[PDB]
Structure formats: structure tokens, C-alpha cells
From a paper:
Recently, we and others identified [name] as the [name]-specific histidine N-methyltransferase that methylates [name] at His73. In both substrate-bound and product-bound structures, the [name] core region adopts a V-shape architecture and is composed of N-SET (N-terminal to the SET domain), SET, iSET (an insertion in the SET domain), and C-SET (C-terminal to the SET domain) domains. In both substrate-bound and product-bound structures, AdoHcy is located at a cleft in [name] formed by the SET and C-SETD domains, and is buttressed by iSET at the bottom.
To avoid the methylation reaction, [name] was purified by including a 5-fold excess of AdoHcy in the buffer that would compete with AdoMet for binding with [name]. The complex was crystallized and solved at a resolution of 2.15 Å. There are two molecules in a crystallographic asymmetric unit. The complex structure therefore reflects the image of the pre-methyl transfer state. In the substrate-bound structure, residues Leu67-Glu83 of the β-[name] peptide are visible, with His73 occupying a hydrophobic pocket.
Residue numbers in the entry:
A (entry chain A): 21 to 41, 44 to 502
B (entry chain C): 67 to 83
Amino acid sequence: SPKEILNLTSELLQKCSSPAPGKEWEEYVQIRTLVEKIRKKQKGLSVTFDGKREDYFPDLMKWASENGASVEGFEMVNFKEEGFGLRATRDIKAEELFLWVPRKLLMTVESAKNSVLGPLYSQDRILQAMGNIALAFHLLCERASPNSFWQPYIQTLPSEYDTPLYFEEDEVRYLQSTQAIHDVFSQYKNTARQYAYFYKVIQTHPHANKLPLKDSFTYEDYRWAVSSVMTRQNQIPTEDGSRVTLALIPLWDMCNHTNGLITTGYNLEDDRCECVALQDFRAGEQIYIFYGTRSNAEFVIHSGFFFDNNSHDRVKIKLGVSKSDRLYAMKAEVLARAGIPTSSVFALHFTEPPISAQLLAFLRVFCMTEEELKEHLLGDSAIDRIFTLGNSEFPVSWDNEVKLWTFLEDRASLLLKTYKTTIEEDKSVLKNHDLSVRAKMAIKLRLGEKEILEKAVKSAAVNREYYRQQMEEKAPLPKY
Amino acid sequence: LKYPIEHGIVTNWDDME
Ligand SMILES: Nc1ncnc2c1ncn2[C@@H]1O[C@H](CSCC[C@H](N)C(=O)O)[C@@H](O)[C@H]1O
């Protein structure tokens, strides 16, 4: 019944528009219950295709070929580990330009603007503010349009993903007490709110009348659409080069991820995405790219996978100067002069050094004495001292270093104590239980947070001892 | 690389903020 669904989406909209609530897990399960009740009453994806997704890869190649893309030297293969990807059919040398996609093939915020979505786009404040959501509805509308220019692309996309939107409740439960689970909560709530909001908007807006979505628009549709966008979308320049926009990039976006550097760039002159080989690829070898320097929390939540030995992995750490601090005003002014907020969320990194220049600078100011602060505020050398604040080669004093690394060691240790399991229990779960891909993603993610924190504890302890040695031996302070 | 392209670049999905 259309009336019951309208009733349920109004309840879902209400529920998912209330502010953030130790009630976040309860709220999440409450929203899940509503979403699953809606999902079980709907018919899955509004549009499904008769063939297997590989049945449509020849159409993808022919379409891309006719519009100027590279279609020789690789084939599509379903790999067990990464899913479908590209495999070399000839030897491809590192730095060879082997893959290119002209703009005509892309789905962009601009092509969304000029599509059947156009009228709703010009009127809806969310679509105008958020190109990622616009891209998601663009994909849905074209998916439900049998003569869309982009059907060869849409028919070769996956039908499901491993973003946490597809996790079972017990798979997300593994993440209780972590940092990442709050971003899992937010993604689920955002997505449920967006589905209910746009469901009602499509029913009430004249601009939506010609959209296929007006006759069918399921929660499954929206979960698929946003998961397609978050696991594949890209920032590229506009045609004029004057702005950035969001885009889906056919054919090239089939490359799976490995460690390395970004080797894909936009060529404005010839108006196409260009990819040079990240490494040598022998015939028979999967062609990989490096997606970008994201954390494993970002790979799980937004890309749907956990990358082992992600050398850019990190966790968040919130720090600020407290207004109870007797030196608050001085510290806040030094931070301001260094371009650093008095409170923010920093990162702790898996690769040494565990902290960035900005975080080192914050921690030095955080632990400065009044005399040290005065030297960063007054006189002909103050600006020089601000300039080196993020430079580990130029400490403010040995005492300042000992204090800040002591603080970091204790804080990272304190954070380790807030997890419901230890690192060793996590390894034991992974060794002794037989788990799904999704459950393994969750347990590896919670293990990775703790391992980053433990590495930060050891690193700060080592730094504390190094700087305490310089202090006891009255080493001469480096000068800038 | 003038316009490096980051596959699956993270975006803000929070329409309230
Ligand atoms: N190194 C990796 N390990 C596991 N999965 C990966 C991976 N790199 C990419 N993926 C998968 O590929 C998706 C990005 S698009 C890459 C093509 C995709 N495999 C497809 O079948 O269409 C991710 O959401 C994730 O599911």
C-alpha cells in the first residue's frame, strides 16, 4: 500500500531528523528496525537487469570505444579478493599512459543538471548543495531510463556493496566502543533521513513528475545509489577549469586499489581522465591504481573494504586548550598566530612520526610555560619561533618536549583503555572464528584503531626518553 | 599531476551540517 509506505517514511524522516542522542547504539538499532520494516515491504531495486553483470561488459567496451576511450590491453576479471577488476592482456610498463576516458562518458553534477533530474535539481536545496547526493539521483534516474546514454555503464555496476549500510546488526556490533562506529551511525542515519526526505519530495514536487522514481523509489534504490557514488566518485575540474565538480568515471573506475601514489589525472586540454601505470603489469596481472591516502575507517565506511597494511592509516584525537588553563589567552593567541585553532580533531598516524607538524605545534603550545609563550608573542624573534613550531628539529625547550611526549603517551594509553576488547582478543577472534567479509572488516578496523594507539604509545615513550636524556645531559638547544 | 583524480574521494554526506 502506498499509504503505509508514506506513513513509514514520515516516521523515518521524523526519527532521523532529531538531534544526536550513550544513546547512539540504541538510536541506531531503532533506525535499523524502521528501515528494515520498510525494506521488507518493498521490492528491492526498482530496476534489475536480465543478464549477469559480466554479460554487459562488451557493451561497456563498445560504448567507451566509440566515445574515444582506451579499450585495448586489458580485460575484465572477477577476482575473489577485490571483486571485478582490470587484468593486463599485454605487458604494461610503469608510467605508460594506458587508460583514458573522455569527459563525454562521465556522469557529473553538470550532466545531472541537464538530465530529466534537471527541474527537481533547480528547486531542491539539498540537491543544489550536495553534488554527491545529486550524482546518486542522477544514477538512479538514468538507471531507470532504458535509453539512457549511460546504460552500458550502469548495467556493469555492482548490485550490492560492503559499505556498512549493508552490514547486519551483529556485524556493526563488533565496532562498539570504537571511533569508527560513530561514523557508521551517522552514515546510516544520514542515508535513512535522505531516503525518507526525497521519497516525500518526489511525491509532492511537480518537478519530479517525469522522473521514473515517481512510480518506484525504494530504500534499496537509495542505498545502492549512494553506495555506488561513495565507493566510486571523483573530483575533477569543470570544462572551463574554473571549478571542481564530482564525477563517476566509467571503465577506469573498475581498477582496484593497491599501495602507491596517485597516477590518474585530468587532462584539461584534451578533456579526458588519463591513467599511467602505477607499476609494471605483466600480461595476466591485475591492473591496480592507488585510490588516495585514506584511512581504513574511510576505506571501510566510504569504499566498502579494509586494506591490509594501509600505510596511511590513522585515528582521530580531539585536543584543545581549556578555558580553565591559567595561560589560556596566551596559548590561544600563539595558536592563532600559528594558524591553529584552540580546539580541534587531530590525527594519530600509523607510520612514524605518529603526529603531524600541526599536531606537534599544538602540543608544544599546549605544554608551554608562561615565559616560553612570551617568547612566541613578543619581540623581534617571536615570528621566527612561530615558524618553527611544527618542526621537530627545533624544540622550544627540552622540558617542553618531555612534557608533550609524556602527555601524548598518557593520552594514547588512556584511549587504549576505552575499547571493549584488547588487541590480543581481536587477533584471537580473527584466528579462531570463521567470519564473513563484512564481519572481518569490522574486527580488523577495531583492531587497527588499537594498534595505531599502541604504536603511538611506544613512539611517545621513546621520544620522552630521548628528550629527557638531552635534558639531563644539558644538551645545547638547536638554534634556527 | 595538475588535477590528480582520487578514486572514491570522501565527501560530506551530512545534509544537516
Ligand atoms: N584492494 C581491495 N581489496 C578489496 N576490495 C577492493 C579493493 N580495491 C577495490 N575494492 C572494491 O572495489 C570497489 C571500488 S570500484 C573497483 C571495481 C569493483 N571491484 C567492481 O567490481 O566494480 C570497492 O568498493 C571495493 O568493493
